Design a binder for this molecule. Sequence first.
Ligand SMILES: CCN(CC)c1cccc(NC(C)=O)c1
Ligand SMILES: CCN(CC)c1cccc(NC(C)=O)c1
Ligand SMILES: CCN(CC)c1cccc(NC(C)=O)c1
Ligand SMILES: CCN(CC)c1cccc(NC(C)=O)c1
Lengths: 306, 306
Amino acid sequence: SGFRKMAFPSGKVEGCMVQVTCGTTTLNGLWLDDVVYCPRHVICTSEDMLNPNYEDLLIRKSNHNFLVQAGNVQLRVIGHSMQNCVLKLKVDTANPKTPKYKFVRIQPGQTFSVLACYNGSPSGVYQCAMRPNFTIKGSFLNGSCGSVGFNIDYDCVSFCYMHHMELPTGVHAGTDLEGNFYGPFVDRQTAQAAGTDTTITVNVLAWLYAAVINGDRWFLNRFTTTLNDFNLVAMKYNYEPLTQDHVDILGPLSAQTGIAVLDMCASLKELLQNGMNGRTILGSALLEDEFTPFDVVRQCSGVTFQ
Amino acid sequence: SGFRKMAFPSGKVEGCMVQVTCGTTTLNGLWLDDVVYCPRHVICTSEDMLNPNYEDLLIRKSNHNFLVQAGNVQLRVIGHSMQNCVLKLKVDTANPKTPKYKFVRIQPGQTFSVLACYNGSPSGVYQCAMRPNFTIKGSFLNGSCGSVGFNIDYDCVSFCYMHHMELPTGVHAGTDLEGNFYGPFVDRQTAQAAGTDTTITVNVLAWLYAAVINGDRWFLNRFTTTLNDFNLVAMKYNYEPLTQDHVDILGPLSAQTGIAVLDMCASLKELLQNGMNGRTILGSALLEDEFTPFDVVRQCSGVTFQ
Ligand SMILES: CCN(CC)c1cccc(NC(C)=O)c1
Ligand SMILES: CCN(CC)c1cccc(NC(C)=O)c1
Ligand SMILES: CCN(CC)c1cccc(NC(C)=O)c1
Ligand SMILES: CCN(CC)c1cccc(NC(C)=O)c1
């Protein structure tokens, strides 16, 4: 027992990180098969970032201008192309440590692990969620662009995120591995504001189920509610509206705890209205929203879902 | 910027995890060079765990009774010995993925990463601290015994923890890799109670420095204090006493923030006396104590310490 924010083991992704240098800009790439993926802003000088025209900047770049280093080995670049906001560098050597993998574009509320990297070298791993405003709240310093986010199912790495930049408010924006930004952001050094960071209700519910399973039960109340009554409350507190799709994926936790989803919603409603009164749940004094229902069911062995 | 609870990349340790079966008990081992390390309770039946005599139980075990599996490959056991509460199984094959490594026994307050594993297969990674009562607050389900905790310095893995059991209160106990328990615990299925779980003051201070660096400054107050005045307050709130050794390792953060260590102590004292008044620090509504000063300096690039 116990319940922790837990990342995926990172070794499968570690073996894919490389350093990419163009001119005087160095960042991280992702080497899969014979392609290296990286943010296209590798081609920009810091001054170019103010108002880049990427197509124009790319005219002055050849294969031999992209330096790709995998530990000590230099990789030979034999082609390059731009796909949305990523560059794809064709190299002459397939990565021997390529894992089984897919590229997936996740929805807001979904969680994933980030392998923060500098100069192609992995430094740390942590779990993130895609916020409803399409930012993530990461930890990223100079040189971490091109660090990736992923999920693992058995032996298959699903890559869902590549880090591109930090907003003025200190939250993070990036792309899928086809180079499409999450949210409205662009790869330009011009101030860009995030929308409302609402709480991922379905995740808070999952985590409340996790707390019950671990014996944190003080917050369980005597009430139930309806989806509409609950949503009236959610909206007030900047919680995402709960739908029947959300209710459906909470089914295994309801069954384990014997606590009906709507009963748990009524407990959550009272927490929102009364606060926690200085108490904790799973060692937190706030309601945690970066565990999905699927995440919980992975750390609560006695939840039946498969 | 941003600040996250971040584990070490786990790939170096992933390549060392094996499954160890003895009779009908299966758990995890750590394969380094030609030795596999695992909890000695692998030899016990569930009934044996009530009151095991390990020396006596071991008389009835031979090399061929320990099944060691590395993925599909079965490893041949050519010797075994008990060292404190661990078994060392000599195998005929050195692990080809052995990293540079050391065994270290950590102090209370030190942090490390756990690679939670089942059947020799890594499932998740998270950061832990050794609590002042010599427990950890982990996430461990059936079959996770022999999962390890570690730190990485550049290319060298320092192993500091091996998981052995869960106390009745749902917290975790284990050994160093020489098989000595942290704290007073024993590998027997008899109820064992933990002492006071005090807060690691020096870590809370480090994390307050991390918050300042990231622009969370609301809690900075107008006061300073002394080590004795502060410690009078610490004791009341079940905080570890702060020493000049602690003050010394906070030196780089004081220098960066220009906030004297004692000034930060005075801010902490006011948080203890007044609470957080519904505010957050680094997205927490409580004072976080599982980041060391060394941990902070790794995610706050503009802290000068080397
Ligand atoms: C838009 C400008 N760019 C891209 C070069 C930018 C802005 C802020 C921060 C970072 N770097 C990280 C690691 O987020 C990168
Ligand atoms: C029904 C089983 N569970 C959670 C218990 C499940 C199954 C499919 C998808 C998701 N989705 C998320 C976001 O967790 C969750
Ligand atoms: C003392 C009995 N043992 C050892 C077999 C024990 C007790 C509780 C839990 C676990 N297992 C884990 C993963 O902690 C193991
Ligand atoms: C002085 C540099 N730092 C932290 C900034 C440092 C150096 C050596 C040891 C520890 N120790 C811990 C527990 O963090 C910390």
